[PDB]
Amino acid sequence: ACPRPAPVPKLLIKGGMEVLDLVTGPDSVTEIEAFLNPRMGQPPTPESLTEGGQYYGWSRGINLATSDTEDSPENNTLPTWSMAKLQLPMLNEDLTCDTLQMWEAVSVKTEVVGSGSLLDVHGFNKPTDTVNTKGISTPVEGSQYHVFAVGGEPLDLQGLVTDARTKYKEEGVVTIKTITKKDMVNKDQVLNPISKAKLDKDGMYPVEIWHPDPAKNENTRYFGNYTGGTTTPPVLQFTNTLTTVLLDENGVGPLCKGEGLYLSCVDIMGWRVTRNYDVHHWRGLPRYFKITLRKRWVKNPYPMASLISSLFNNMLPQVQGQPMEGENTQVEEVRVYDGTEPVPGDPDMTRYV
Amino acid sequence: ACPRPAPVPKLLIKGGMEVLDLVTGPDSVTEIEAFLNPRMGQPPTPESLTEGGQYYGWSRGINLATSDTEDSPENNTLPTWSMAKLQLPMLNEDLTCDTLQMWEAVSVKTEVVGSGSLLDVHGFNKPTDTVNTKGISTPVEGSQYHVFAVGGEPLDLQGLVTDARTKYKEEGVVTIKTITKKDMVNKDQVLNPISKAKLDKDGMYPVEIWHPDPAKNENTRYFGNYTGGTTTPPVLQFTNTLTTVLLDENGVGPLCKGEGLYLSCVDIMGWRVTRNYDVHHWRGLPRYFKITLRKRWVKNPYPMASLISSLFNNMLPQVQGQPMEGENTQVEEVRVYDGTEPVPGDPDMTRYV
Amino acid sequence: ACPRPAPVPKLLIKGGMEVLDLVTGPDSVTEIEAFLNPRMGQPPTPESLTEGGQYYGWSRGINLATSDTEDSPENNTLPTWSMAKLQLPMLNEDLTCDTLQMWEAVSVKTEVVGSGSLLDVHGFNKPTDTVNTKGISTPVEGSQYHVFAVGGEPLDLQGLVTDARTKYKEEGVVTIKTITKKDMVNKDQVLNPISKAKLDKDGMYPVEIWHPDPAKNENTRYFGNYTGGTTTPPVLQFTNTLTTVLLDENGVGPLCKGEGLYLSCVDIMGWRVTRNYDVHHWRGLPRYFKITLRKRWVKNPYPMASLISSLFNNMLPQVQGQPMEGENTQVEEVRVYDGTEPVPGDPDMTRYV
Amino acid sequence: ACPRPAPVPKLLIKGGMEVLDLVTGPDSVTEIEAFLNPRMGQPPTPESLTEGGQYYGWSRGINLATSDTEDSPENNTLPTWSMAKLQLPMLNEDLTCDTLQMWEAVSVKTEVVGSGSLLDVHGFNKPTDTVNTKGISTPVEGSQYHVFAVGGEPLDLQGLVTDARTKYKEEGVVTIKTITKKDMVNKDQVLNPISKAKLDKDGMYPVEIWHPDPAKNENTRYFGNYTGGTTTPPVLQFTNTLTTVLLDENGVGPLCKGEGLYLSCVDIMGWRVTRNYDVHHWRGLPRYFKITLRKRWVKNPYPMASLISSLFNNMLPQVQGQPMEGENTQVEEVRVYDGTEPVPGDPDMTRYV
Amino acid sequence: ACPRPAPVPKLLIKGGMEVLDLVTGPDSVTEIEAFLNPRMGQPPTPESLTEGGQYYGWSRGINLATSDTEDSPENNTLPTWSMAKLQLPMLNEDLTCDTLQMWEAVSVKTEVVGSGSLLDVHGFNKPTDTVNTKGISTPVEGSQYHVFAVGGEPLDLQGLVTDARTKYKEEGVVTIKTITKKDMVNKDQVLNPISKAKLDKDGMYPVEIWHPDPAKNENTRYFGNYTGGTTTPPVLQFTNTLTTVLLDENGVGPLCKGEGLYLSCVDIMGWRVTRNYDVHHWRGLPRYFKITLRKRWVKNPYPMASLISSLFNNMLPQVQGQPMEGENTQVEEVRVYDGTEPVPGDPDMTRYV
């Protein structure tokens, strides 16, 4: 006799991360809304807007090379990767019949926030009438670079650079020399399979050195786009309604290793030009993530009965011995036999080219 | 024996908002056509086209900063948000079996009107042959910014700015300082979760400070796009035939809280340049909305038997006491028990990192 | 025993409009191919290519404003709307059981013709090497504006302008002052719901004043796009194979009121620059329409037994009396009762805000 | 017991056009791969690369008009249409039950070849540092124009021009004056329904005069796109995998009249600028077609028993007599009666406007 | 009683190419991840970053032509094609019932790596303020050219050039003169069906001479796009989630001839400009391929009982004799008869035009 409203998913509880401390069930869905600020040059710590003008959100400046051979980019001028790790609660286990529950990033709604800010055409930027210093304050223009990644483990990065003779500072930034303790080689200018790293720190990996690794990220979905030039107009489309599916060919999506969910981001909008000279502070805007996660039963990867193994590995000493791994390995050959075949003829035949 | 025309929806009555005073039924559909004018600088009140030339639809001018440290943007030069609230009639209630009827925005047909106006190449604008002051009057160019929102409650805004040392006037405009009574901090240049507001006024929230909040608007669908630059050609596509679906993942769409339907808009097309100097009045065009609404049975959110509660709250005094909420809350812990579990071991275990 | 060709629609007769004088049947389909020439400045009448060079297809020139306050655009420089009305034959009627047959525009294939003409880089236009007057004759560039509409009644236009102090000539052009006999107000610069008109004349409504009305055209499908700038390259895609569906949400499409089918068009490609000065004649190309129509049984809208009413209205005089309509109406209230409700309490309750 | 490979269409024979001399059957499919070279100015005949540098593939130059009134475009500077006709074999006929077999173009895979050639930045073109004549040789830029057509009969062209006072040479080129023996009128600058032609010659119809006729081509599918400007960067996308469907609304596609298949093409990429002056040779690239054809049973259009008619028409003389066709026709009225209707009232009623 | 995880494909073994030495089965799927470095000018061999600055990844420079007639492009300045061949293992054969197994490229995931590197605006490039040599180091801009191909045989190339009087070096590069031992003709500037080659070498075929052949590649899927200009901003979109289907109309995709899988690539991003002059080194980025292959049963193409034939061909001498093939062939006619037709009339009738 009464009207029936339409069925919608029932919201049990909402709030902060504390809400995740409620044991819900196997088919419960969790939506986490977070944001990442642009780690582009100036750090957030000196909150006083008088040191230089609080370039938080911008770089500190830019210094061209003094000659073809020595370049020092002055870390507070290099835009870097933003990252965060959301720590989710633990789930059920099934040690009897080896099986485990973990979080599974199902969808993401992402949005770059604050593009209207670039409609600020007053201010002390290089004017449009440079001969009379009037007109409007030139807005942000130039190269744009928008990458975001959602994963269950830190984003794998690959090292690739322009001029490999660049001398980056050796602290406060993670470069190729920091990972491979040697210098940078010419192969670092195209693709070196050894210039690999992970995005564990925030504000430390510059985006002009470290790019999302295409060969590696299998628990991570990353989306990026680049636009070059010096006066390229920025373009941003924000919307409440579009969502990205994080599922893969098998319909799984990023499983949160351990219990963490990693968000990586960089959103460079272009440059600002000052008035006395042509200093070219970068501009970056924050990114909003809304990740929709569910619970999935997976097969337990670790036979943590290997604790016994760990036992025999902590009590037994650390031996060096002679190389049995690497390139100078002294292992000649390893063969594995399982069944019984008919007697072969010449047993050593392969691809014959 | 007679031919049968095709069945179409039957139009009961059409006219103004007065038409909504007719009790129609549960499956009646209502289409409301309205428009919003650009609140870009000059207000509509001085209708005389002689004060400065009636910049209604344009800004009053633009004033660059006098130095890096003091910026005063002179409110009549800041494009702001346009908003309107259409008041719909009341619907049925079901106090016996708690249930209520409210309006539900199902679709919207929106269109920016007057793009052909920008084909006016006569007039006293900066000519294309600046050395002989001939050619054509330079048309509107520059940064474009098109946002529109349809919701059941006012659009939630988030504060984000360029230079945070800007000194906006303290009346006739709503800035971040107006909402958070303190000054603007460096965090206001990237993302401060406290610089939140709502779009209740019209012509008061500048679009260079206030952006659609991605974390908040759940009864509101907003669509925006930005294009930077100084000479970027405007691009507009108007059409009679395209319509936007306002339904969400559950197939609901914006429910009109109370009975109001909120339309928010900003459509900046670029700048005009004057002749004697390079003054850079903004340009904005009106937006036409056609919202298609139906009636939906929902579950009554308020147990307005809480009127009794309101009773005990109006008679009982207003106490201050000691803080039990906030950050200096003196509440140590709150526990909720409902059922009976087996006796746990250590009852305090969480995500272990 | 014979091979069977595939069934295709059978062409009864083809030719000119005379062909429509053949009574075909209820499920016959008619395809009409027509074209509209650009009404952009110079009229077609002085066919001699010696007056100024026969700018037919171009404007006559351009004259910037002499000051901020007086602008006279010299009608032969304003691009205007092109329109045509194709008169279709009468159809059957069903006066016994009130029902009528009318034409129904089902599809349209449209195409702007002559874009290759803009590959004419010889000629006396402003050269690309302006210091030596060599290179190529600068081709057509600038703002483009492409609108076309197919309807059963004339296209409804809405008035919107740039500077409202512009003094358009009072004959040979239809402006806002022509429709509303007063001058233009500041509201005419954003949106005035009274600056409405219809596209009945051809070459008389300038496209910088009159835009397709979004609130009105319900028997008309219009499609437009605008591109600003001063040197924006034109872009045109012509094709034999694409067709636009004119049906609406109910699957009807434009019904031809009376028996006419109205085609409206404007296709501005940009400007040409002359050599001695920077005169900026517009350029426009013709548009080809191929409209596919069928017959539809509709419900007869007019109870032309109201001829009797018309009787009593032609014999009875024209009275003025006191205002019963308008804003100064002397009608206090009108109530309509049809059935019998239970006795209400307070009968005057509405939306309570 | 053996594995079964997947079924694919069986290739009977491949080679040149000679292969088509094999009577295959009714459901055989034929794929023909051909190419068309750009007929842009310089003809292919003087193969020596010393006359001027062998501009084959480019124009010979460009000559601006000497005044507003006399323009002579010097035929070897006008890009023209490329066309070819592939002659297919004859098929079966069914004179007993009137029916005929003809070829039917079902799909096309087309591709512009040689876009990488425009990466040649060495050479004697206008440098990028014009004050020191260094940098790179400016690559091809400017207006691009890409049209291709596949049909069963020659492509129908419509005449449309810029300035109609242009004096084209009267041999080696087909202009509007060549088809209509009179001069060009102002109507030739917008749309003259009499400036019609067909694409029978190759390298003779300039693309700045002759455009694909939208009203005519019904056995031809044409696709074109134009991009204006003077420095517009070329854009080309070549791919092995995309194919265009040539079928129409009835699912037929171009039937090869007689037995020929007509390919029409023009691919202009922009200009090259020389060094001593700003001569602006055009650039064009070849186009590759891969047309997929099948056989279709159609109804025989000609009752070639009309050979008897042709008999009585070759023996009987050629009379002039008085005009019975045209505009001065002396035929007053023609009426056709077939059945018997009830006696009408006024028999002369039409569309009453 | 236990939860069931979702079924996913089971990974037998992963590692290097050695992993392919495991006989898996008929429905096993193999995913190979590889990369190709840009072969753009400077070779990889002089690894010392002191010769000129290690332009590995860039060209060595650029030298304009000294006159219209002599051009020498200095091989280390020409971007060339990158290629690789992955050698896969041998599969099963079915000599009894003629049938063979071969690898079949089913999908590809490709990505250009290192676009963020172009955000390096420090360094010794031409500054943006050229009058004060300040601002930023101009980033990579200009013509972009992105082609990639996946096939079972080497990519077939077609020769097409700009100026055919260019004198390329006769070693270290493969030009049209290298393949056709004669010089280049004017036909080489549009399309010569004899200027064909194959991509067997890497870093030897310049992309300004050799383009993917549209008539030839049937076991190869290639995708390319070109963007001209001198300051065109680069645009790159990298993503983890998109994959290209290599299957064709029959649903087969590239079959690996022999056992090799050929990857071809070129990714030019634009130029870098130096400071003292306007030298214009190219820029190229590596490409990552992830090819997904399966096994397919095909029909054995070679009747290698033709070994017997090969027998009679190695023992029998090499005769010259008189031409029986070519253009001066002395074979008059070859006829093939198989069945018995009714006696024809005139047996020599063909397409009659």
Residue numbers in the entry:
A (entry chain F5), B (entry chain F1), C (entry chain F2), D (entry chain F3), E (entry chain F4): 18 to 370
Sentences copied from the publication:
MuPyV and JCPyV are non-enveloped, circular dsDNA viruses with capsids ~45 nm in diameter. The β strands (BIDG and CHEF) are connected by flexible loops (BC, DE, EF, and HI) that extend outward from the surface of the capsomer and comprise the majority of the VP1 hypervariable regions. VP1 C-terminal extensions interact to link capsomers together forming the T = 7 d icosahedron.
After icosahedral refinement, we next proceeded with local sub-particle refinement of the constituent hexavalent and pentavalent capsomers for each dataset. This sub-particle refinement allows each capsomer additional degrees of freedom to move independently of the rigid icosahedral matrix, which compensates for imperfect icosahedral symmetry present in flexible virus capsids.
